[PDB]
Amino acid sequence: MIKLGIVMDPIANINIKKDSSFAMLLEAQRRGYELHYMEMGDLYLINGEARAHTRTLNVKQNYEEWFSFVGEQDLPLADLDVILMRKDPPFDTEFIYATYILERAEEKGTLIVNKPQSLRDCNEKLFTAWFSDLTPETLVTRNKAQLKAFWEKHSDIILKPLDASIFRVKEGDPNLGVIAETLTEHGTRYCMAQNYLPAIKDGDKRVLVVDGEPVPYCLARGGGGEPRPLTESDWKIARQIGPTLKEKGLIFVGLDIIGDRLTEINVTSPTCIREIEAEFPVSITGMLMDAIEARLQQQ
């Protein structure tokens, strides 16, 4: 049938209660796919060939034993029909080099759920530089003198590292200096600066997109988790980003919407699946897998 691999962080350590990857696995299993489990380190490249040491995976909703290995083989990634890259950030050289490996398989027919080139191209933070009109005032620099001006120009702003650890730098803030100095490491690393949107008060909204189609229910993070229907402005945004997602082969994405402003695009390991699923008649995992099987046919 379909032989789907997954590349992820130790299954031994996920929490099956909130883990979105695991939600996928349950769904593919239910559909009668054969599952192959890999880790960064199982990925190898021998003379131009992507190969891996996989384990055959059986997952089950069981807190005492959610997974089990039922086989193990070394093979060509090109044997798998689809591989889900579900590695948690940060985006390091290690992730980038892995995308080169996943990409050799792809050239030999495997489908990579998020396309490898696409993962290099779309920084989680910097992709938003291509969606100017939908995001907040954003500055990306190494110069303290620029952060400071930005701050003078906006009074209240968000400071963050490109690779949460967000600094809210308000009027009266005695520390911009040290922050700049800290985040850019004495001006040798780039850092992002952004004006603050008090709208996060109303919650930090996480919206999912499956092959360009926004899931109609989102997750707000404004004190606790609270799913809800997409606002008229959620459609609007997702609606505008969507086409680019589909064509860049970014088949499963998370959007971080703060108010009516797009703050970030999660292309690596977007989550929040189980949260919405509990509360609404929606199978996000089923959409995804629907999207996979169909891509699988076209190509």
Give the overall shape, derived from the CA principal axes. Answer: globular
Output the CATH topology of the largest domain: Rossmann fold
Please give the number of β-strands.
17
Kindly, what is the distance between the CA atoms of the first and last residues, rounded to a whole number of angstroms? 17 Å
Structural class: alpha+beta
Number of helices: 8
Q: Which range does the strand content fall in? A: 25-35%
CATH architecture of the largest domain: 3-Layer(aba) Sandwich
Please compute the radius of gyration using only Cα atoms: 20 Å
- Encode the helix/strand succession as letters: EHEEEEEHEHEHEEHEEEEEHEEHH
CATH structural class of the largest domain = Alpha Beta
Largest sheet: 7 strands, mixed
Number of domains: 3
* Helix content bin: 25-40%
